[PDB]
Design an enzyme around this catalytic site. Structure first.
Site, PDB file in Angstrom:
ATOM      1  CD  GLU A 250      39.001 -47.512 -41.542  1.00  0.00           C
ATOM      2  OE1 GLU A 250      39.380 -47.229 -42.701  1.00  0.00           O
ATOM      3  OE2 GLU A 250      38.190 -48.426 -41.280  1.00  0.00           O
TER       4      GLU A 250
ATOM      5  CD1 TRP B  10      35.571 -48.238 -38.692  1.00  0.00           C
ATOM      6  CD2 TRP B  10      35.201 -50.255 -37.784  1.00  0.00           C
ATOM      7  NE1 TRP B  10      36.626 -49.046 -39.037  1.00  0.00           N
ATOM      8  CE2 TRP B  10      36.423 -50.288 -38.492  1.00  0.00           C
ATOM      9  CE3 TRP B  10      34.757 -51.425 -37.167  1.00  0.00           C
ATOM     10  CZ2 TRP B  10      37.206 -51.437 -38.566  1.00  0.00           C
ATOM     11  CZ3 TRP B  10      35.486 -52.582 -37.294  1.00  0.00           C
ATOM     12  CH2 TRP B  10      36.700 -52.583 -37.991  1.00  0.00           C
TER      13      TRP B  10
ATOM     14  CE1 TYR C  62      42.156 -54.477 -40.102  1.00  0.00           C
ATOM     15  CE2 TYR C  62      40.058 -53.497 -39.539  1.00  0.00           C
ATOM     16  CZ  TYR C  62      40.802 -54.330 -40.335  1.00  0.00           C
ATOM     17  OH  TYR C  62      40.170 -54.997 -41.328  1.00  0.00           O
TER      18      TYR C  62
ATOM     19  CB  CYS D  16      38.485 -57.375 -44.424  1.00  0.00           C
ATOM     20  SG  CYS D  16      36.750 -57.801 -44.092  1.00  0.00           S
TER      21      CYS D  16
ATOM     22  NE  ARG E 170      38.349 -61.950 -42.420  1.00  0.00           N
ATOM     23  CZ  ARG E 170      37.052 -61.763 -42.699  1.00  0.00           C
ATOM     24  NH1 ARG E 170      36.455 -62.479 -43.631  1.00  0.00           N
ATOM     25  NH2 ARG E 170      36.356 -60.843 -42.053  1.00  0.00           N
TER      26      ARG E 170
ATOM     27  CG  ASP F 280      31.818 -55.176 -51.209  1.00  0.00           C
ATOM     28  OD1 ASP F 280      31.533 -55.285 -52.425  1.00  0.00           O
ATOM     29  OD2 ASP F 280      31.220 -54.405 -50.410  1.00  0.00           O
TER      30      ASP F 280
HETATM   31  O1  LIG Z   1      37.716 -53.243 -44.524  1.00  0.00           O
HETATM   32  C1  LIG Z   1      36.801 -53.918 -44.996  1.00  0.00           C
HETATM   33  C2  LIG Z   1      35.741 -54.517 -44.237  1.00  0.00           C
HETATM   34  C3  LIG Z   1      34.796 -55.224 -44.869  1.00  0.00           C
HETATM   35  N1  LIG Z   1      34.800 -55.411 -46.231  1.00  0.00           N
HETATM   36  C4  LIG Z   1      33.681 -56.173 -46.839  1.00  0.00           C
HETATM   37  C5  LIG Z   1      34.037 -57.514 -47.482  1.00  0.00           C
HETATM   38  C6  LIG Z   1      32.782 -58.348 -47.231  1.00  0.00           C
HETATM   39  O2  LIG Z   1      31.743 -58.127 -48.181  1.00  0.00           O
HETATM   40  C7  LIG Z   1      32.343 -57.851 -45.855  1.00  0.00           C
HETATM   41  C8  LIG Z   1      32.916 -58.639 -44.700  1.00  0.00           C
HETATM   42  O3  LIG Z   1      33.007 -60.041 -45.091  1.00  0.00           O
HETATM   43  P1  LIG Z   1      33.171 -61.188 -43.973  1.00  0.00           P
HETATM   44  O4  LIG Z   1      33.360 -60.542 -42.574  1.00  0.00           O
HETATM   45  O5  LIG Z   1      31.914 -62.063 -44.021  1.00  0.00           O
HETATM   46  O6  LIG Z   1      34.364 -61.916 -44.478  1.00  0.00           O
HETATM   47  O7  LIG Z   1      32.766 -56.466 -45.783  1.00  0.00           O
HETATM   48  C9  LIG Z   1      35.781 -54.842 -47.043  1.00  0.00           C
HETATM   49  O8  LIG Z   1      35.840 -54.970 -48.264  1.00  0.00           O
HETATM   50  N2  LIG Z   1      36.739 -54.129 -46.363  1.00  0.00           N
END
Ligand SMILES: O=c1ccn([C@H]2C[C@H](O)[C@@H](COP(=O)(O)O)O2)c(=O)[nH]1
Ligand SMILES: NC(=O)C1=CN([C@@H]2O[C@H](COP(=O)(O)OP(=O)(O)OC[C@H]3O[C@@H](n4cnc5c(N)ncnc54)[C@H](OP(=O)(O)O)[C@@H]3O)[C@@H](O)[C@H]2O)C=CC1
Ligand SMILES: NC(=O)C1=CN([C@@H]2O[C@H](COP(=O)(O)OP(=O)(O)OC[C@H]3O[C@@H](n4cnc5c(N)ncnc54)[C@H](OP(=O)(O)O)[C@@H]3O)[C@@H](O)[C@H]2O)C=CC1
Ligand SMILES: CCc1nc(N)nc(N)c1OCCCOc1ccc(-c2ccc(C(=O)O)cc2)cc1
Ligand SMILES: CCc1nc(N)nc(N)c1OCCCOc1ccc(-c2ccc(C(=O)O)cc2)cc1
Ligand SMILES: O=c1ccn([C@H]2C[C@H](O)[C@@H](COP(=O)(O)O)O2)c(=O)[nH]1
Lengths: 523, 520
Positions: free
Chosen positions: A300, A322, A348, A408, A428, A431
């Site tokens: 990635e 993805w 990105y 994110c 932002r 998880d």
């Molecule tokens: O690079 C990434 C992409 C996604 N998420 C997780 C966080 C959230 O649980 C979800 C995306 O959240 P929102 O798009 O609703 O903010 O995927 C990550 O931790 N990292």
């Protein structure tokens, strides 16, 4: 009273890994010696650790110890006890061990055999007798294996100060397998690098006006998690391993998080605003409380750097991160009805090489369109290193609705001092259970890649979390993982000949000495 | 000395008194009005008071009795001494003060609840009793005489940050006799901010393990005695200490690095501060700050304006130097008008992605109005993690008079409460960061009110964080000042849309500050 508590008998040792999808456990670190000497060349940091521990004394605590030992029978220095093989392995210039009372176990050798200021004892029973006679703070048993083995058997060790050397060497003698029922870990150090190996230091345990003002200032102090379910985690006294930044944040969300629902309907516990810092000079912060792979996240990262927005490139390397964000269904729910499947839009890669260009489709030739922010930040680090504008931004407000989803990972800011490169990444949405372990890995690797192609050394990767959440369906799995004790982190090696950011391929990356707990389905 | 032997402390609570203005500790001198407390009851002080004057630890008593006895040549509770007025002002349901040994100094009253006729007959009574500590509760008369005769070991001083009508005062406290050792968090109760300060008269198996884990811990061209006052505090819980600790840390451990101007800085990388907007308004008190300009800049932003002249004509000069002919020529903006700063904050919040022509063009309905967007998200989808407002337009940077220092705001909503993160790429700790905290604090309120939420936390993430070398002597003076309780912000509650605020709709209340510091 136990003999070992009366006389304060501790053991200290350093164990490496030994030769052979392996299993790891505490017994992975067990290699003590090889052909009379140590398995490794002198690791400096362990030697400084061993001296500090074996030389340190607190005089104002002697009094209570003098009493305790008196009660049981009716400058201050520690005692160190060595087997005879151990004694012979030490270089002459380090003998006797300085600022310590040296004791040696032997049958074949007698006091007449030694020029040095040392006590010779022919049996362990005689050690207790000697300790009974001497003024001393604490008593450290220094090995070797035969010595360790018999002091563990006799229940004579109150605590084991244990260095995990995170490398493999040829060994011929081994620390005894510790019994989890007899001894449990209570403390774990920061991780360090010395002499091209990571290591950490763990402690096994055998199983005042202004104080009131504190209480006063605390006169004004939810989730159904049983504290018991964190037995191991809460038993630890010193949680200094940098993996505890992650795990502690999990704990904090479990205990104090806010219940909210998200798109799915799962629900999360959420909090808002955390920082973690990892020192890449000393370790690669790949989590060890569970198994993590890096092939995909490197693939990635390379796909990003090439500017790509085509999901099929990853699917064809069998990287699926993805996949779900590229289905007909997903794109249609995003109202991207005119978007080909697996065309993820100006995400990105596109923003990094072409911010502000009009996205067409994933096959277009966007050369010399947009701002190549990646190039510009590499130029800034090389030629304007004190700039406070070295920032790479994925969040292009205009193109957000045309992305399969918003980033994110909002931005990286870079910092250079003294030929060293640090990186802030602002996330932002986090998880904690699934995404963050990978994201730390990704931006840590990218810090190395940027550092190297600008002739700097990596310093600190700093991860700033905004909306940080644990999914409810991850809670039980996280409960388990939180009760695992981290191992020493691995290292990352990059091919040194790669001198431009776009010239890296998967085989230029090596992770070494990854020691980790078992894999976990978070689900 | 007697007060050491018998552990005689004072505990009191002082408001400001109705009469530029100067402030010092004496500002907080008001105890009573007309035989009653000047304020209507303040709960947090009552709960503090109670918890202070009932707390005992029985494990510590041996030492106390030991000393006491050696001196007299010989269910634990505390003692609480009151004046008569003091004792009567208390309502009956609170007399006798539960769980405490109640003593009353009086020359007229007639004898479980002891009466004493003069001061010396307390020390006698203390010599007879078992008790943990002895608290003087006032009133003014009691404080005066207990104080003038060196009978007080510590003062537990509640600083009530509001003005009331008063007829009786606390004595002045002599900074030669006493000095502050500790300062609490700031809190809001009963419509006032308050803090708690302390005056002072002028398994160790794991204890070894801590030392071992420190075996590797080892720039400072600054000195100890430089920060005597700062370093001699024990508890530093005032949130102003988030700012000041960061300065301390940069001054102690900062990297020497030189900037474009050849000034020189000490810089570090990656800090967080968090200020609770529900309890106070974090306007630094260890020096004077003004807010009109920074509010006007916030209003200029919201209108979407890029015209330096608008601010200049209201005598706000924040952007002046960034708008000069020289400053734009150096930025290679030869075709840009003086004070036309180009596509900065305002333009990005209301027209992100529009093509910028000049500061006079009509941009209605051009680009993304992300401020409208974030306000709509807050109102309609409060659990979104996509509520960000971003000024960093990679495309427009070069056309801006300078890139934004304030990269973005992220918002978060729980239980009717809004918190905001601001990420700042470059933080002039000495001059800029105090204003910046005020700026995003107010904005947080502005956004919250217009979405029918309560402000919770403002959270400030510092990227490149630095202290200019010509600031160092002034930050030295500043670190050794002791914060006061913070003020509060009041917004005209009528305003319900983000664009309807005017300068008149903002009021700072009860701003108690130290003297202005000329940063140079
Ligand atoms: O690079 C990434 C992409 C996604 N998420 C997780 C966080 C959230 O649980 C979800 C995306 O959240 P929102 O798009 O609703 O903010 O995927 C990550 O931790 N990292
Ligand atoms: N990595 C680490 O932390 C450490 C590593 N080491 C390594 O370990 C190895 C040495 O260990 P190992 O081979 O077990 O040898 P030891 O150091 O355990 O020495 C054993 C010898 O000590 C004497 N001895 C032991 N117990 C007694 C007893 N109860 N009564 C009397 N004499 C006793 C005997 O000496 P004699 O034969 O003369 O009678 C015996 O052969 C080396 O390779 C050394 O480098 C050593 C210490 C620490
Ligand atoms: N905010 C705060 O921290 C506190 C405020 N207060 C307020 O303070 C006010 C009361 O203060 P103030 O008016 O000074 O009254 P006091 O509570 O100080 O009462 C003074 C009286 O106590 C007796 N007394 C005092 N000194 C002596 C002495 N040396 N020997 C013998 N008897 C003595 C005398 O009563 P006598 O006539 O019997 O001789 C004297 O007139 C009220 O308004 C009350 O609400 C109350 C508690 C603390
Ligand atoms: C490994 C130390 C250690 N650490 C932990 N944590 N626990 C222990 N029980 C322990 O061993 C203590 C007993 C042995 O002490 C030695 C051994 C070797 C040397 C040495 C010095 C220089 C060279 C060189 O440069 O050639 C080689 C060897 C110095 C002291
Ligand atoms: C203010 C407390 C305090 N705090 C500090 N830090 N120091 C002190 N010396 C101190 O007061 C000392 C004596 C306290 O006596 C009381 C007790 C209760 C009331 C009271 C009044 C009105 C209501 C009502 O209207 O409900 C209820 C209760 C008034 C005075
Ligand atoms: O609102 C503002 C504007 C400017 N700065 C400071 C930060 C830096 O000292 C400088 C910006 O210069 P560069 O970082 O762009 O070089 O201004 C602030 O702290 N706040």
């Amino acid at each position: 009273e136990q003999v070992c508590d009366v006389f304060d008998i501790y053991a200290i040792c350093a164990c490496c890994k030994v030769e052979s999808n392996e299993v790891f456990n505490n017994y992975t670190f067990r290699g003590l010696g090889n052909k009379g000497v140590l398995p490794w060349k002198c690791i400096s940091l362990d030697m400084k650790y061993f001296r500090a521990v074996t030389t340190y004394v607190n005089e104002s605590k002697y009094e209570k110890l003098k009493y305790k030992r008196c009660k049981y029978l009716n400058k201050l220095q520690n005692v160190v006890v060595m087997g005879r093989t151990n004694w012979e392995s030490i270089p002459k210039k380090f003998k006797p061990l300085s600022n310590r009372i040296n004791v040696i176990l032997s049958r074949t050798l007698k006091k007449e055999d030694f020029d040095e200021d040392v006590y010779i004892i022919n049996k362990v029973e005689d050690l207790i007798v000697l300790l009974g006679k001497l003024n001393y703070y604490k008593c450290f048993i220094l090995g070797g294996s035969v010595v360790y083995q018999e002091f563990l058997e006799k229940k004579l060790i109150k605590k084991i100060y244990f260095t995990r050397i995170n490398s493999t060497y040829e060994c011929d003698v081994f620390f005894p397998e510790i019994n989890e029922n007899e001894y449990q870990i209570i403390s774990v150090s920061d991780v360090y690098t010395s002499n091209n190996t990571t290591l950490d230091f763990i402690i096994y345990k055998k199983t005042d006006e202004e104080e009131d003002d504190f209480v006063y200032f605390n006169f004004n102090k939810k989730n159904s998690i049983h504290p018991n379910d964190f037995q191991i985690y809460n038993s630890l006294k010193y949680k200094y391993h940098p993996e505890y930044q992650y795990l502690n944040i999990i704990y904090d969300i479990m205990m104090n998080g806010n219940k909210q629902s998200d798109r799915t309907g799962v629900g999360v516990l959420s909090k808002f605003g955390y920082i973690m810092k990892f020192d890449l000079s000393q370790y690669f912060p790949l989590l060890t409380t569970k198994k993590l792979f890096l092939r995909g996240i490197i693939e990635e990262l390379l796909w990003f750097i090439r500017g790509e927005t085509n999901g099929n490139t990853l699917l064809n390397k069998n990287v699926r991160i993805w996949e779900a964000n590229g289905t007909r269904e997903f794109l249609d729910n995003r109202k991207l009805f005119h978007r080909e499947v697996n065309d993820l839009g100006p995400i990105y890669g596109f923003q990094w090489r072409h911010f502000g260009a009009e996205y067409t489709n994933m096959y277009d030739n966007y050369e010399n369109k947009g701002v190549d922010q990646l190039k510009n930040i590499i130029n800034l680090i090389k030629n304007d290193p004190t700039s406070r504008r070295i920032l790479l931004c994925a969040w292009n407000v205009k193109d957000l609705d045309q992305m399969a989803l918003p980033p994110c990972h909002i931005l990286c800011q870079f910092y250079v001092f003294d030929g060293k490169l640090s990186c802030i990444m602002y996330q932002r949405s986090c998880d904690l259970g699934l995404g963050v372990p990978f994201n730390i890995a990704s931006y840590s690797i990218f810090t190395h890649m940027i550092a190297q192609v600008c002739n700097l050394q990596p310093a600190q990767f700093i991860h700033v979390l905004g909306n940080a959440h644990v999914y409810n369906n991850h809670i039980d799995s996280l409960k388990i993982q939180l009760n695992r004790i981290p191992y020493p982190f691995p290292t990352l090696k990059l091919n040194p000949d790669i001198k431009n950011i776009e010239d890296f391929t998967i085989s230029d990356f090596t992770i070494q000495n990854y020691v980790h707990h078992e894999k976990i389905s978070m689900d």
